[PDB]
Amino acid sequence: MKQVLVACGAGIATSTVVNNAIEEMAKEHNIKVDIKQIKITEVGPYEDTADLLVTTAMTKKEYKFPVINARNFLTGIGIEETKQQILTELQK
Numbered sequence: 001m002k003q004v005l006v007a008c009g010a011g012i013a014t015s016t017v018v019n020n021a022i023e024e025m026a027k028e029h030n031i032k033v034d035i036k037q038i039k040i041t042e043v044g045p046y047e048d049t050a051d052l053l054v055t056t057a058m059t060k061k062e063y064k065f066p067v068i069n070a071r072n073f074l075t076g077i078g079i080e081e082t083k084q085q086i087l088t089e090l091q092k
Contacts, residue, residue, distance in 0.1 A: 002090055004052040005036040007043050008070055018054070018073045025083055031091055052086060 004022075008015040019035050026033045038046055040058055047053075047064055056070040068086055072078040 002031075002033045002052065003036055003050045004033065004054065004086070005038050005043055005046055005050050006070075007038060007040045007053070007055045007058075008073075009040055009058055010056055015070075015073075017076045018070065021073065021076055021079050022083070025079065029087070029091070031087075033090055052089070054086075 006015040006018055006022075008018065014037060019037060023035050026035070036046070036050065040055070043050070043053055043055075044061070051065065052068070053063065053065055054068045054070050054073075056073075059067055059069070066089075068082060072082040
């Protein structure tokens, strides 16, 4: 089981496109992955239990995992790109 969180802070209240996107891809792949949604100040305690984290900005902390910028998820087209990187470990 892979618990991947998602913390975005640009305009939308929560990461809708990202989640709705990833969740759509994970299904096609049929992998045992579960997406998680939390606030920017929620990833702190959710660093251990969680496995992967993705954020657009505000990534200045003692993270204990390979954070992946959410720049690719700006519109919703360059998902496959980053997805390939994160998936490299998911289904390594």
